[PDB]
Amino acid sequence: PKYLFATLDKAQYEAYCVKVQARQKKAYRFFHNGLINNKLFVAKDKAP
Amino acid sequence: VHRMVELMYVKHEKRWIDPSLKKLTGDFIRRVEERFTSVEGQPSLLQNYSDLDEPYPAVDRILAAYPEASTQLINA
């Protein structure tokens, strides 16, 4: 991964680095909520 | 842990709305401790709830010895 990031600017990379860690916290919330309640899989009913 | 203190300990009077609510905040703290320790033997940094009398001073100290406790959200 580092080698991809070496295409950008500290500008971009460090702006992406913030998006990532926000996701990791939604993902973290989801996983623990799902482990407990048995919903790591949500079947979609209606299309968008 | 912080928000508990904020809403159960009145800063400008230096008192808890009730000893029980102090115990509450204290217990959950202990919990956050346990969540973030992973070897047996290490004792609690809150060995007596007497500490939460002047809370906001000492709470930060306990929360300090468990770094990640400020990094990640509550386990479901």
Contact call for residues A40 and A31 (beta carbons, < 8 A): yes
Contact B76 A25 (CB under 8 A): no
Helix/strand number for chain B, H first, E second? 3, 2
Alpha-carbon span B17 to B46, nearest angstrom = 20
List the structure tokens of B61: 């100290």
Interatomic CA distance for residues B6 and B56, integer angstroms: 9
Question: Torsion-angle region of residue B14: left (phi > 0), alpha (psi -120 to 50) or beta?
Answer: left
Which A residues, 6 through 45, put their C-beta within 8 Å of a C-beta on chain B?
25, 28-29, 32-33, 35-37
How far apart, in Å, do the first and last CA atoms of chain A sit? Answer: 33
Report chain A residues whose CB lies below 8 A from the CB of B35: none
Resolution in A: 3.1
Three-state secondary structure call for residue B42: coil
Cβ–Cβ below 8 Å for B76 and A36: yes
DSSP A1-48: -HHHHTTS-HHHHHHHHHHHHHHHHHHHHHHHHHHHHT-S-----S--
Instruction: Report how far Cα A7 is from the mean position of its chain's Cα atoms.
Output: 22
Residue B68 · residue B36 · CB < 8 Å: yes
Name the strand (E) or helix (H) holding B17. none
Residue with tokens 């080698």: A3
Question: Which residues, including other chains, have CB under 8 Å from residue B10's CB and lie 6 or more apart?
Answer: B17
B-chain residues near A28 (CB < 8 A): 72-73
Residue in the structure block whose two tokens are 């919990």: B31
Q: Are B33 and B45 spatial neighbours (Cβ–Cβ below 8 Å)?
A: yes
Q: A26: exposed, middle or buried (C-beta count within 10 Å: 0-12, 13-18, 19+)?
A: exposed
How many whole angstroms separate alpha carbon A15 and alpha carbon B14?
42
